[PDB]
UniProtKB/TrEMBL annotation, chain A:
<protein>
    <recommendedName>
        <fullName>Cytochrome b-c1 complex subunit 7</fullName>
    </recommendedName>
</protein>
<comment type="subunit">
    <text>Component of the ubiquinol-cytochrome c oxidoreductase (cytochrome b-c1 complex, complex III, CIII), a multisubunit enzyme composed of 11 subunits. The complex is composed of 3 respiratory subunits cytochrome b, cytochrome c1 and Rieske protein UQCRFS1, 2 core protein subunits UQCRC1/QCR1 and UQCRC2/QCR2, and 6 low-molecular weight protein subunits UQCRH/QCR6, UQCRB/QCR7, UQCRQ/QCR8, UQCR10/QCR9, UQCR11/QCR10 and subunit 9, the cleavage product of Rieske protein UQCRFS1.</text>
</comment>
<keyword id="KW-0679">Respiratory chain</keyword>
<dbReference type="GO" id="GO:0045275">
    <property type="term" value="C:respiratory chain complex III"/>
</dbReference>
<dbReference type="InterPro" id="IPR003197">
    <property type="entry name" value="QCR7"/>
</dbReference>
Automatic annotation (TrEMBL), chain B:
<keyword id="KW-0809">Transit peptide</keyword>
<keyword id="KW-0679">Respiratory chain</keyword>
<keyword id="KW-0999">Mitochondrion inner membrane</keyword>
<keyword id="KW-0813">Transport</keyword>
<dbReference type="GO" id="GO:0005743">
    <property type="term" value="C:mitochondrial inner membrane"/>
</dbReference>
Automatic annotation (TrEMBL), chain F:
<comment type="subunit">
    <text>Component of the ubiquinol-cytochrome c oxidoreductase (cytochrome b-c1 complex, complex III, CIII), a multisubunit enzyme composed of 11 subunits. The complex is composed of 3 respiratory subunits cytochrome b, cytochrome c1 and Rieske protein UQCRFS1, 2 core protein subunits UQCRC1/QCR1 and UQCRC2/QCR2, and 6 low-molecular weight protein subunits UQCRH/QCR6, UQCRB/QCR7, UQCRQ/QCR8, UQCR10/QCR9, UQCR11/QCR10 and subunit 9, the cleavage product of Rieske protein UQCRFS1.</text>
</comment>
<keyword id="KW-0999">Mitochondrion inner membrane</keyword>
<comment type="similarity">
    <text>Belongs to the peptidase M16 family. UQCRC1/QCR1 subfamily.</text>
</comment>
<feature type="domain" description="Peptidase M16 N-terminal">
    <location>
        <begin position="22"/>
        <end position="168"/>
    </location>
</feature>
<dbReference type="GO" id="GO:0046872">
    <property type="term" value="F:metal ion binding"/>
</dbReference>
TrEMBL record, chain G:
<comment type="similarity">
    <text>Belongs to the peptidase M16 family. UQCRC2/QCR2 subfamily.</text>
</comment>
<feature type="domain" description="Peptidase M16 C-terminal">
    <location>
        <begin position="1"/>
        <end position="145"/>
    </location>
</feature>
<protein>
    <recommendedName>
        <fullName>Cytochrome b-c1 complex subunit 2, mitochondrial</fullName>
    </recommendedName>
</protein>
<comment type="subunit">
    <text>Component of the ubiquinol-cytochrome c oxidoreductase (cytochrome b-c1 complex, complex III, CIII), a multisubunit enzyme composed of 11 subunits. The complex is composed of 3 respiratory subunits cytochrome b, cytochrome c1 and Rieske protein UQCRFS1, 2 core protein subunits UQCRC1/QCR1 and UQCRC2/QCR2, and 6 low-molecular weight protein subunits UQCRH/QCR6, UQCRB/QCR7, UQCRQ/QCR8, UQCR10/QCR9, UQCR11/QCR10 and subunit 9, the cleavage product of Rieske protein UQCRFS1.</text>
</comment>
Length: 101, 422, 55, 49, 49, 442, 220, 52, 54
């Protein structure tokens, strides 16, 4: 059935970052893989992300949020960084395994 | 144990040629010759061929930028890319036991590049460096401007990406360039040191981008220009040429010989070439240090011929004029029946020695297997070379004196003459 | 040399690079106020302690 | 001789910046034999003829 | 030119064992080092005490 | 297959002429070939006042013999399409010729005529005097060479090996027709020479020609005596030639090597294979297997670096050389010495497995053409008193393992006083003491 | 002057008379706008033949007079406009040096319409070298020039630059009526012949930008 | 008209990038930009760089 | 930074003032008192604490 889907969309809404207009990926802690992943982003996706973040920080400082209409919707959240991040990790593991044996 | 093998040379339906040998050398050397170079660029994608050369280590669909290097080094192998203005050669080298291993990467690099935007982007600033070292030899700077002044297109294109285009090349330009030029009917898979059956199994059973002759090079058009680079150097380099002959041209062998008759590069360490009319002719005119030689290039649909000099700035005039008289004096029966005989062997020797090197050999077996379709006999080449008459030579000399010249200088030119003062 | 003596001086450069021109996130909340309070508190404990230690 | 050269482990590198010959001896053999080739290796120096 | 340059004579300062320009200085190496390292090791022991 | 191809390689035939000269060759199916004479003579054999003779000679060795003056000699070589070249090092000189297998015999005659009858015309000597002086000023602008000479100059200070091959300015300005003659007579002698040939030539036909033009036999017992040279003393020291007006700095550091004979040289070369070399045009970039190359790329430590195992009869130099911007010298040196310590203490079986494969490919590459195979034969006999095949080398190389490399490197590197040569804007690299401490503790 | 100025008289170094070459230098640099100049040796300073080109200049078009307007009195411009359809500019180029001079035209255009623009700029020079100069075009230009010259001297800089250029290359000040008199004394023939001198003389060219469609001096 | 110009307090400056180096789109913002005549060059100790 | 003596915010300090710190090659023994003064100070404090405790 649709259990996992109901849970996921539930959590997504419970989390609330969409209220700041943030995309799930905009909320990733910038560890090393994410740092690299971001460097691989196309200029436009990078600048869009940048504005979204600066926008959230300004809301956060103001102690306000976006008008309900503008909240990112679960099914419209573009996972723009995940493809890159998964590759950066794919490469790192290869190197890691190769430097052992 | 092992003995004498035979140079097989199949060809598949898609037009992919496969030349092979086997001298039971402890090490194998495989290459991928391709009809593709800076000659197929347009004002729009200049330099793309250069970057494609430096991009050989980038990630491919089968192997990562990482595995390609660590993988080849792991087996003491090597991987390089040599390319002229109209041919690119991707060759690897290794011990016989690892050919298979090293092969995977050669396959991937020439047929399955990915040209990931970021890899490409991080790479571009390298064109800046790679160019800076090459241009240390003034030799390379003048030949860039020579071809420039000599032509209006194709061959007129620089071999090293122009400055204004550094960092402006795209993954798209790379992809399109590889799709329209790295096509099976324009490629050959040569390979010294392996059974012909295996090198064949690899080719067919593996290669993709194919069938056809995609982009075609817009026939080279002679211009006959004169580019001069005043740069302060105490040593002036200069080249004066005329349209020479194309590859395979009957008129080819003639210039090759007229070359050696005039002097084509020293044979005795620190010695004053005597068999060199041009050199000897110059020495009589100048008194300070210098060098002068016969310049000859054979391209698909055209060629270049003339001389190249180096001299102190002040004695530039005397050296180039002297180099000229020596070309006119030859265009006037000034060629003994013996000079033609010396040169003839001088050439068969040069050619012959130049094939002791696995690189030289593969480069020979390849250049033919691609531009032709088969391997000429080393006796045919020698037979074709001596069949050159004392007239063939003298006439070639005339074609130079009569034809329209294009020149290229470099250094302090305050005493260097203009093409119209010769 | 440096135009303003807040950037060049080996001491005023320190007071400056940690309390005046120091880049801070535009949105830190009041829960980020405790570090300074802890500091002020410390200076305070020391002062009152010395005063007591003297008797 | 369709060789672009015959008409047109080891190796030493170099370095420059961006952004000498004084006798007929240290100059002879430096007059463009023929075409100009260019090479690049993933493990060895860059060369040019 | 650099060819006209040579290392001065350090006879006035050389230890005996490496004073002869024709004898392998490697034979007395472990000796010259064992001594200086002995002095150091001793200073350590004294300091440890 | 690899194993077998090594065996099929045609053996090297060697026969000595009763006058002391040795004749060796490796016959191939090739139509072209190379033959020349490799002499055991160089700058190490020279003294204070005749330093450079072997070089001044090398310059005249081609200006013709007595049997045939300049124009004739040259004309005769050129007109037969043969290439005549040669060189002169510190412990080795050689003159070889490249020609068609046919001319093999006429070649020998010419080789012999040069090594025996060099005309040494005096008008020529006053000309080479200016030529050499120029080559000194030109070579003086090649930091890599200025640096290895300084390395030698200090590493072996106070001895023969401390001299440059080109000699001094004073010597070139005053060497005499006599001295040159004397040099040739004293040094170019049958027992100290080797006639080497590679290509499509018959050993028989070769040795025959030898007996013919390499005649002059000895009477006494001293004429058959090959003098053993006075050993050169190594010195842990440094020479720093500073010039901030130079674009980049050159640094060369090294310890004393064993000398040709020693089997440890195999291991050492495997070691150097682990550290390898690098230059800014290596496409491998940040992925190179060499840890030092990688860091070099990651931190932009240098324009290039190389390891070397320069062997001599009784000594040697095992070190490395790098070129780097004034402000990265320290870190480079730091990472470099680091990799050395890594060698003595933690080399892995993975690193060696690869080092061996790199070394095998390297040795095979030294036999690509007749001239290089001839050079190998000339030097092998002269240094190892015989030829060592690829089949044997490979065996030696296969025997090396991590354990071995560590022990050998510890033996020559660990806690040793190195020799240091630094040229250029070297302020950031400093104190011998600090460099010295880098010689211990991984 | 008297009481101070030193550095003795004379003329020390002398300039080695300029020698015409007629070369063609091209700079491929990617720019979307191609600049190009094609000239021939022309009049020298104070030359008799000078005033002729000055007029042939204004007859062909020597720089706009109406803000954002399409010069009509400009045969060259009008001639180009009929050939191209995209943005551009084209003018008569004229330089007068002590012992030589340069004359021709200068263009600017989108890289692709570079061919049509320069060829068109050429025909307009040939068509003029073939009597294509009305007796009126000569009259317009004549005043167009006296006006330009005249206005160009309202500026203290312009004036001093005039009074100076003469006082140095000559020795005295020409009358503003002499200049005007010398300018209109130019015949309809003087002009047409100047045009011929250009069509006949050896040309030298200089381009810049993306030249993939720009022609070579020998394709004109 | 022997003027090199008559044949081809104030003043505004500019700035670019070095090392290597670092818009016109209608017949209007281009007209009058075709080399009137020779090229002059100026420098002032108190004002912008000029060029014609 | 390759060596953790240049990059580490603390070892960089110990380094940039006691290990790689550029000192004149010829300072005499009269330049030895600064360190003695320092050591003295740490010494006074240590013995002082020990006494203050009784
Ligand atoms: C981190 C700072 C400090 C803390 C947390 C602190 C805390 C305390 C505490 C919990 C007491 C007992 C208070 C009571 O009577 O219930 C105390 C007493 C005392 N402290 Fe501190 N103290 C600090 C610093 C100092 C300093 C710097 C001095 C001395 C210069 C000092 C001197 C004293 C003295 C004299 C007393 C005893 C008199 C009294 O009980 O009020 N204190 N301190
Ligand atoms: C700059 C460092 C210091 C100096 C110059 C110094 C100096 C002195 C002097 C002159 C005396 C008297 C000695 C005598 O004649 O009996 C003294 C006593 C004493 N000092 Fe210090 N002192 C220093 C630091 C300290 C510190 C840090 C403490 C406490 C942690 C301390 C605790 C004492 C005590 C308990 C005495 C009294 C007992 C005695 O007289 O020996 N001192 N100090």
């Amino acid at each position: 059935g649709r259990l996992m889907d109901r849970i996921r969309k539930w959590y997504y809404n419970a989390a609330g970052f969409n209220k700041y207009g943030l995309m799930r990926d905009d909320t990733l802690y910038e560890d090393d893989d994410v740092k690299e992943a971001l460097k691989r982003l196309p200029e436009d996706l990078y600048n869009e992300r940048m504005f979204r973040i600066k926008r959230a920080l300004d809301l956060s400082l103001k102690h306000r949020i976006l008008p309900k209409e503008q909240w990112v919707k679960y099914e419209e959240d573009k996972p723009y960084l995940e493809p890159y991040l998964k590759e950066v990790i794919r490469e790192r593991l290869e190197r890691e395994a190769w430097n052992k044996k | 144990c092992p003995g004498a093998e035979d140079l097989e040379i199949t060809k598949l339906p898609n037009g992919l040629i496969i030349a092979s040998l086997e001298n039971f050398s402890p090490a194998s050397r495989i290459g991928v010759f391709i009809k593709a170079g800076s000659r197929y660029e347009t004002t729009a994608n200049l330099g793309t061929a250069h970057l494609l050369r430096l991009a050989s280590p980038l990630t491919t669909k089968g192997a990562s930028s990482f595995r390609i290097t660590r993988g080849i080094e792991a087996v003491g192998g090597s991987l390089s890319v040599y390319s002229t203005r109209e041919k690119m050669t991707y060759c690897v080298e290794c011990l016989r036991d690892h050919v298979d291993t090293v092969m995977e990467y050669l396959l991937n690099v020439t047929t399955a590049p990915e040209f990931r935007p970021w890899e490409v982007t991080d790479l571009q600033p390298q064109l800046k460096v790679d160019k800076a070292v090459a241009f240390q030899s003034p030799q390379v700077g003048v030949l860039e401007n020579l071809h420039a002044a000599a032509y209006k297109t194709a061959l007129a294109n620089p071999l090293y990406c122009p400055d204004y285009r550094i960092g402006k090349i795209t993954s798209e330009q790379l992809h399109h360039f590889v799709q329209n030029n790295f096509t099976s009917a324009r490629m050959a898979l040569v390979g010294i040191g392996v059974k012909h059956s295996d090198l064949k199994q690899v080719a067919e059973q593996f290669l993709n981008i194919r069938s056809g002759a995609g982009t075609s090079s817009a026939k080279a058009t002679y211009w006959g220009g004169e580019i001069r680079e005043q740069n302060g150097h105490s040593l002036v380099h200069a080249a004066v040429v005329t349209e020479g002959a194309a590859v395979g041209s009957a008129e080819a062998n003639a210039f090759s010989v007229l070359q050696h008759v005039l002097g084509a590069g020293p044979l005795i360490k620190r010695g004053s070439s005597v068999t060199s009319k041009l050199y000897q002719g110059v020495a009589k005119a100048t008194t300070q240090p210098f060098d002068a030689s016969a310049f000859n290039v054979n391209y698909s649909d055209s060629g270049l011929f003339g001389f190249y000099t180096i001299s102190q700035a002040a004695h530039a005039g005397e050296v180039i004029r002297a180099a000229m008289n020596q070309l006119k004096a030859a265009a006037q029966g000034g060629v003994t029946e013996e000079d033609v005989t010396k040169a003839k062997n001088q050439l068969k020797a040069t050619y012959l020695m130049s094939v002791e090197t696995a690189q030289g050999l593969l480069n020979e077996i390849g250049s033919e297997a691609l531009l032709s379709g088969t391997h000429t006999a080393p006796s045919v080449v020698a037979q074709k070379i001596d069949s050159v008459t004392s007239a063939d030579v003298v006439n070639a000399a005339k074609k130079f004196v009569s034809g329209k010249k294009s020149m290229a200088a470099s250094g302090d030119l305050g005493s260097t003459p203009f093409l119209d003062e010769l | 040399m440096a135009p303003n003596i807040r950037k060049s001086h080996p001491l005023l450069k320190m007071i400056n690079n940690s309390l005046i021109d120091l880049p801070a996130p535009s949105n830190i909340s009041a829960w980020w106020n405790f570090g300074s309070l802890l500091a002020v508190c410390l200076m305070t404990q020391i002062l009152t302690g010395l005063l007591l230690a003297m008797h | 001789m369709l060789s672009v050269a015959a008409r047109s482990x080891x190796x030493x590198x170099x370095x420059x910046x961006x952004x000498p010959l004084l006798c007929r001896e240290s100059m002879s053999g430096r007059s463009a034999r023929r075409d100009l080739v260019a090479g690049i290796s993933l493990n060895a120096p860059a060369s040019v003829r | 030119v650099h060819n006209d340059v040579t290392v001065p004579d350090f006879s006035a300062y050389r230890r005996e064992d490496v004073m002869d320009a024709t004898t392998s200085s490697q034979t007395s190496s472990e000796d010259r080092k064992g001594f200086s390292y002995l002095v150091t090791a001793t200073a350590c022991v004294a300091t440890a005490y | 297959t690899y194993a077998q191809t090594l065996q099929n390689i045609p053996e090297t035939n060697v026969t000595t002429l009763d006058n002391g000269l040795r004749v060796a060759s490796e016959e191939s199916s090739q139509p072209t070939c190379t033959v020349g004479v490799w002499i055991g003579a160089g700058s190490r054999y020279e003294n204070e006042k005749n330093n450079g003779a072997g070089y001044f000679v090398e310059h005249l060795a081609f200006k013709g013999t007595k049997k045939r003056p300049c124009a004739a000699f040259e004309k005769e070589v050129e007109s037969m399409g043969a290439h005549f070249n040669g060189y002169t090092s510190r412990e080795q000189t050689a003159f070889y010729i490249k020609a068609l297998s046919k001319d093999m015999p006429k070649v020998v005659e010419l080789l012999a005529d040069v090594v025996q009858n060099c005309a040494l015309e005096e008008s020529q000597i006053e000309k080479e005097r200016g030529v050499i002086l120029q080559e000194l000023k030109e070579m003086d602008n090649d930091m890599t060479n200025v640096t290895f000479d300084y390395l030698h100059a200090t590493a072996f200070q106070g001895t023969a090996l401390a001299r440059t091959v080109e000699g001094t300015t004073e010597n070139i300005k005053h060497l005499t027709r006599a001295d040159l003659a004397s040099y040739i007579d004293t040094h170019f002698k049958a027992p100290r020479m080797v006639l080497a040939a590679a290509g499509g030539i018959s050993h028989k036909e070769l040795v025959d020609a030898a007996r013919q033009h390499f005649s002059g036999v000895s009477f006494t017992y001293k004429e058959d005596a090959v003098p053993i040279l006075p050993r050169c003393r190594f010195t842990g020291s440094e020479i720093r030639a500073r010039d901030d007006a130079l674009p980049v700095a050159h640094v060369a550091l090294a310890v004393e090597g064993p000398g040709w004979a020693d089997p440890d040289n195999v291991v050492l070369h495997v070691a150097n294979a682990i550290i390898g070399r690098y230059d800014r045009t290596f496409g491998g970039g940040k992925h190179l297997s060499s840890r030092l190359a990688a860091l070099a790329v990651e931190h932009k430590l240098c324009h290039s670096f190389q390891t070397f195992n320069t062997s001599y009869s009784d000594t040697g130099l095992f070190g490395f050389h790098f070129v780097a911007d004034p402000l990265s010298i320290d870190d480079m040196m730091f990472c470099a010495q680091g990799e050395w310590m890594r060698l003595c203490t933690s080399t892995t079986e993975s690193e060696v497995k690869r080092a061996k494969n790199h070394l095998r490919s390297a040795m095979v590459a030294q036999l690509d053409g007749t001239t290089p195979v001839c050079e190998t034969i000339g030097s092998h006999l002269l240094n190892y008193g015989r030829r060592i095949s690829l089949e044997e080398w490979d065996s030696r190389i296969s025997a090396v393992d991590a354990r071995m490399v560590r022990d050998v490197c510890s033996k020559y590197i660990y806690d040793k006083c190195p020799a240091l040569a630094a040229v250029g804007p070297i302020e950031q690299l400093l104190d011998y003491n600090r460099i010295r401490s880098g010689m211990y503790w991984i």
